[PDB]
């Protein structure tokens, strides 16, 4: 008879490359938001909340998960801690995916509606959005402790069983991964359409005011400006006004009869328009550059969680598949997601200069 051997080396490899990078990676993100006041704004409370969720995985979920790998199938801890550990696993892992969904949506509405709210009014919006995400995560994770594990059986095997959590494995998976994925996919195309439209209207304005100064440049009479300059009447909230009244000021010279004086005044908007739309051009450029980074990073997160959730629902639907050689894959695919959830806030914040500069001095134990 050939029995299974030791697997301590795998657990050791997990500590080095999963647990330690998870706890440490999320600790840096939390510290950066907590210490550096330059990062203490509403948007980064999604990242801090997310970092906390993933931190608790590496602290209370991942270490105990080693015992399943390192020790026998029997639950070594007290029986009461079995559904709790199962609950915390589902809770925090779901919180990670739904946080990104929240961020994916929140980043989209920031593009469609640039002036969403003030600094104060958006600060409370964060807490509400964070709370909802956590409340969603609880409702998805709470079928586990309510149902419980199978209890003359003295000991217990702390594991989600297909014969019991069949509905939960299938539905929970849909509600925890495939549902936010569906949203992040929709908001993706919504974001792509938003950016290409936001720049389409800018190119429209940049071409319609240039066409109305060319007719202002080559002007024979003030009557030629009496209809052409009026077309520019409707084209930092002070931004739109500094050129509106400026264009209206030129019309005052047109009605007065000063044509040549108005043409030279129209050339004064050359340093006004260029310094304004180019400032709004990099606004879109940075908005497009930040969304592309968010897209790829969030994609890799979901992609690494894919092998688990696709296999998890397969364990339920496919009744023809080998149960033994399918749940053994789950025992590996979970850690792939654990790697994903662990380094998710870190990697995303490595593209931010302030976050990255903060991490550099926190490793050197500076803390300002
Ligand atoms: C629990 C088991 C796996 C062992 C403990 C893991 C150790 C190696 C991990 C977990 C948390 C990690 C720490 C998290 C926070 C910081 C602050 C940072 O400025 C320097 C690195 C440092 C100090 C990390 C070093 C490595 C660390 C201590
Ligand atoms: C799995 C592949 C299936 C569909 C991918 C569809 C296209 C890729 C969807 C990316 C989801 C995403 O994270 O998009 C965030 C968006 O960029 C925020 O504005
Ligand atoms: C570590 C505990 N054990 C040993 C039994 C596991 O097998 N845990 C897996 C189950 C999970 C799960 C199942 C169903 C719906 C779900 N929504 C969110 C999650 C989830 C998280 C997911 N975690 C990450 C891995």
What technique determined this structure?
Answer: X-ray
**Would the CB of 362 count as within 6 Å of ligand 2?**
no
Minimum-distance ligand 3 atom for the alpha carbon of 140: 17
**Would the CB of 19 count as within 6 Å of ligand 1?**
yes
Cα distance between residue 243 and residue 6, in whole Å: 75
* Closest residue by CA, ligand 2 atom 8: 185
Given in angstroms, what resolution was this structure solved at? Answer: 3.1
Q: For domain 201-276, which CATH number applies: 1.10.1380.10, 1.10.460.10, 1.20.120.10, 3.40.50.720?
A: 1.20.120.10
55-75 per-residue burial string, b: 16 or more CB within 10 A, e: under 16: bbbbbebbebbbbbeeeeeeb
Query: Any idea which ligand is nearest the CA of 75?
Result: 3
The rounded Å distance from CA 344 to ligand 2 centre is 16
Query: Any idea which ligand is nearest the CA of 89?
Result: 3
**Would the CB of 228 count as within 6 Å of ligand 1?**
no
């Amino acid at each position: 008879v050939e029995e299974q051997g030791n697997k301590l080396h795998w657990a050791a490899l997990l500590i080095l490359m999963v647990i330690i990078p998870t706890i440490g990676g999320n600790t840096l993100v939390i510290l950066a938001v907590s210490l550096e006041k330059k990062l203490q704004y509403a948007t980064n409370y999604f990242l801090m909340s997310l970092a906390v969720a993933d931190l608790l995985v590496g602290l209370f979920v991942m270490p105990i998960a080693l015992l399943t790998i390192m020790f026998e199938a029997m639950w070594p801890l007290p029986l009461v801690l079995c559904p709790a550990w199962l609950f915390l696993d589902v809770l925090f892992s779901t919180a990670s995916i739904w946080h990104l969904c929240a961020i994916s949506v929140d980043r989209y509405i920031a593009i469609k509606k640039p002036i969403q709210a003030n600094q104060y009014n958006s600060r409370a919006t964060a807490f509400i959005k964070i709370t909802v995400v956590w409340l969603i995560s609880i409702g998805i994770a709470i079928p586990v402790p309510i149902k419980g594990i199978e209890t003359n059986p003295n000991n217990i095997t702390c594991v989600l069983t297909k014969e019991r959590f069949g509905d939960f494995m299938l539905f929970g998976s849909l509600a925890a991964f495939f549902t936010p994925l569906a949203i992040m996919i929709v908001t993706y195309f919504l974001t792509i359409h938003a950016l290409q439209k936001k720049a389409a209207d800018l190119e429209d304005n940049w071409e319609t005011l240039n066409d109305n100064l060319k007719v202002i440049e080559k002007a024979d009479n003030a009557a030629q400006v009496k209809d052409a300059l009026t077309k520019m009447r409707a084209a930092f909230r002070h931004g739109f006004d500094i050129l509106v009244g400026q264009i209206d000021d030129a019309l005052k010279l047109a009605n007065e009869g000063k044509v040549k004086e108005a043409q030279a005044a129209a050339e004064q908007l050359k340093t006004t328009r260029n310094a304004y739309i180019q400032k709004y051009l990099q606004t879109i450029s940075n908005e497009q550059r930040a969304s592309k980074v968010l897209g790829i990073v969030f994609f890799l997160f979901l992609l690494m969680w894919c092998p688990f959730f696709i296999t998890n629902i397969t364990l339920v639907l496919c009744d023809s598949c080998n149960q033994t050689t399918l749940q053994m894959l789950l025992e590996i695919f979970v850690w792939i997601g654990y790697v994903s959830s662990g380094v998710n806030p870190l990697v995303y914040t490595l593209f931010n200069k302030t976050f990255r500069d903060a991490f550099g001095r926190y490793i050197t134990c500076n803390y300002r």
